[PDB]
Amino acid sequence: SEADRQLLEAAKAGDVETVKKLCTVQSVNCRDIEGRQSTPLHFAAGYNRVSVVEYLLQHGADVHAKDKGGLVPLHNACSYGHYEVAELLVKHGAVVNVADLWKFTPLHEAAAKGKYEICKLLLQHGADPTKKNRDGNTPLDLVKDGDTDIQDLLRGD
């Protein structure tokens, strides 16, 4: 629907007033069919739209909703280094060990992208650094050579 498209676009853009106008019980968890089925919350999380994330969560957005590839909004937040968004999602009950269709967790994303504080956040909430994805790789396995601090963090040594 045109309405849902506009809502998804507003969430992506951080257009709070438009989100407020278009967010209904029926649209808050709509999906971007023409893309990868991201919800308004996936878009707000991935594009670091904090006010929109907060509003959507308050109005019944599903923190656990998976897109077409099995990503939840916490994956989007962690892959793009959005610490505050990640913390909002976790505080609202996001599962930190959630895995997409390829068994990538948010810790796989934060590790591969060199996001130390996000890795640390996830670990404090019980994220498992030993979880292998379908490639048999743990988050530690995906850390760039240069990020020795993240390596040490994930190893626990």
Partner: peptide
């Protein structure tokens, strides 16, 4: 994993 694609979003608002 090309089929996996990438999460909607980006790291820098700029």
């Amino acid at each position: 994993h090309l089929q996996r694609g990438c999460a909607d979003g980006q790291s820098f608002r700029s």
